Amino acid sequence: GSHMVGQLSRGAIAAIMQKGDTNIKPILQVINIRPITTGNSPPRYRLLMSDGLNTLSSFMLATQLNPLVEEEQLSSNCVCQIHRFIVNTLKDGRRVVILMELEVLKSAEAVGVKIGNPVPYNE
Numbered sequence: 001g002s003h004m005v006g007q008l009s010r011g012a013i014a015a016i017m018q019k020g021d022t023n024i025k026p027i028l029q030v031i032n033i034r035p036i037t038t039g040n041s042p043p044r045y046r047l048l049m050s051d052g053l054n055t056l057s058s059f060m061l062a063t064q065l066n067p068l069v070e071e072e073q074l075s076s077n078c079v080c081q082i083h084r085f086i087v088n089t090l091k092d093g094r095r096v097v098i099l100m101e102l103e104v105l106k107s108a109e110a111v112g113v114k115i116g117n118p119v120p121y122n123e
C-alpha cells in the first residue's frame, strides 16, 4: 500500500555489510537477477537487491533455491523476506551474501516497480 518503501527493511543492507548481523530476517526487493558464468555445475544466480535505501549486487542464491528463479516465482520487482543467509569474504576483501532461505511475500506482478530511490551501497 501507500508509502511503499515502508514495506522494506530500510538499513538492513548496511547492517549486513557493516555490523555483520546475521540474525535479522530482512525484507528486501529484487531489482535484477542474472546467471553467473559457471561451467560444469548447476547454474548460479546473482541478485541486485534493495532495502529501500541502498541497492547491493553482492547476493548469490543457494543452488537449492534455483527452482524459484527458473519457475519465475523469484524475479525482478518481487518483495522477499530473507529467513537465512550466510556471508562469505573473498581473498580480495569483497563480501558476498549467500541467500539460503527466502520467502516471496509479494510477486513481481503484484509490485510492478522498483520501490523508492535506493542508491548503490559502497563497500
Ligand SMILES: O=C(O)c1cc(-c2ccc(CNC(=O)c3ccc(-c4ccc(C(=O)O)o4)cc3Cl)cc2)n(-c2ccc(Cl)c(Cl)c2)n1
Pocket: 036, 037, 038, 044, 046, 057, 058, 059, 060, 061, 062, 063, 064, 088, 090, 094, 095, 096, 097, 098
Ligand atoms: O561469472 C561471473 O560473472 C561471476 C562469478 C562470481 C563469483 C565470485 C565469487 C565466487 C566464490 N564463491 C562464493 O563466494 C560462494 C560461497 C559459498 C557458497 C554456498 C554455500 C552454500 C551454497 C549453496 O547451498 O548453494 O553455496 C556459494 C558461493 Cl558462489 C563465485 C563466483 N561473480 C561475482 C563477483 C562479485 C560478487 Cl560481489 C558476486 Cl556476488 C559474484 N561473478
